[PDB]
RNA sequence: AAUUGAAGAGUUUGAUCAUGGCUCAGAUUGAACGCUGGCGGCAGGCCUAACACAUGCAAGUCGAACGGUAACAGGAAGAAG
């Protein structure tokens, strides 16, 4: 259950006396299929170095998520920079419908049957991220009683 | 048992994030044109000039309301082929 996938890879330019010096960037997501997900950025002058350097970053920076079966307890909202995202339990029809990009975090992270949608900018670095934070804030379907109870 | 269902992409920049229009993948059609065209079932077929119209047909029927015989069908005292 290693499970990992990169979401977006990109080129960027730096500009010096002698011209443009380019380089790449990688955005990755890793999860165990049972909660726990992280993302990593990491950039590098060549692609495989960039994705490698990323998968790593993702290994740490990993948070976990109070799932509830294969789905989410309550419908959650997330938002970071321009990306404002929303996903919903969905008493699984089949489920797992989202914009490949946050399907990526969902998938690996173990959620099996949601419906999701991203608003604002589809800028991956911020949507995958608005989502993680999304699932993170999402609170425990009983440690809400822990919360109250008293 | 019986609406239990929601995805994003391209494009301003050297590059970036934001803002923001343009564009694209989808469904839908009483459709047209271009190329092509085998058979069948159901359906659809002037969206325009409420423009103008040759010709046929689209409202009759009842002799058990009525006087009726002009047509054709028979029959009739009786005149005959
Ligand atoms: Mg340019
Ligand atoms: Mg032809």
A122 touches strand B (CB under 7 A): yes
- Please indicate the experimental technique that yielded this structure: X-ray
Looking at residue A13, the DSSP 8-state letter turns out to be E
Q: What is the DSSP string of A18-65?
A: TB--EEEEEEEEEE-SSS-EEEE--EESSHHHHHHHHHHHHHSSEE--
Q: Quickly give A99 CA vs B30 C1' distance in Å.
A: 38
Burial A33-51 (b: 16+ CB within 10 A, else e): beebbbbbbbebeeeeebb
Ligand 1 centroid – CA A46 distance (Å): 21
Distance CA A74, CA A68 (A): 9
CB A130 within 8 A of CB A123: no
């Amino acid at each position: 259950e290693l499970q990992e996938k990169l979401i977006a890879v990109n080129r960027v330019s730096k500009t010096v006396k002698g011209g443009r010096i380019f380089s790449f960037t990688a955005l990755t997501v890793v999860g165990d299929g049972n909660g726990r997900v992280g993302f990593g950025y990491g950039k590098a002058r060549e692609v495989p170095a960039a994705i490698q350097k990323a998968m790593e970053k993702a290994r740490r920076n990993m948070i976990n998520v109070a799932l509830n079966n294969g789905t989410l307890q309550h419908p959650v909202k997330g938002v970071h920079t321009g990306s404002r995202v929303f996903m919903q339990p969905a008493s699984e029809g089949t489920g797992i419908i989202a914009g490949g990009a946050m399907r990526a975090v969902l998938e690996v992270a173990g959620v099996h049957n949601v419906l999701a949608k991203a608003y604002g900018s589809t800028n991956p670095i911020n949507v995958v991220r608005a989502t993680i934070d999304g699932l993170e804030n999402m609170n425990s379907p009983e440690m809400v009683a822990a919360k109250r109870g008293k």
